[PDB]
């Protein structure tokens, strides 16, 4: 096995979170509330107002 | 008065008691009609008398 990248802490509170996307199926969703490190496939997704 | 985004709940207070906000709580700022005579937006303040 070989290292790829180091996930870092992503502090979060109630009524706060970030958009993310499931690359395996393209599933964007907005995680919120409690602090949540990204899983193996999820990646940051950008909002467009 | 101050509204709590976290509890999704407003709360009001008056008299000789200092306010102590929760982090998501926000002041209900109030525009006032001030100026030497009258003016729709002058001396804005949350401290209604």
Curated annotation (Swiss-Prot), chain A:
It is found in: Cytoplasm; Nucleus. Coiled coil: none annotated. Phosphorylated on Tyr residues after EGF stimulation. Dephosphorylated by PTPN11. Required for normal vault structure. Vaults are multi-subunit structures that may act as scaffolds for proteins involved in signal transduction. Vaults may also play a role in nucleo-cytoplasmic transport. Down-regulates IFNG-mediated STAT1 signaling and subsequent activation of JAK. Down-regulates SRC activity and signaling through MAP kinases. The vault ribonucleoprotein particle is a huge (400 A x 670 A) cage structure of 12.9 MDa. It consists of a dimer of half-vaults, with each half-vault comprising 39 identical major vault protein (MVP) chains, PARP4 and one or more vault RNAs (vRNAs). Interacts with TEP1. Interacts with PTEN and activated MAPK1. The phosphorylated protein interacts with the SH2 domains of PTPN11 and SRC. Interacts with APEX1. May interact with ZNF540. MVP 3 mediates interaction with PTEN. This is Major vault protein. It comes from Rattus norvegicus. The gene is Mvp.
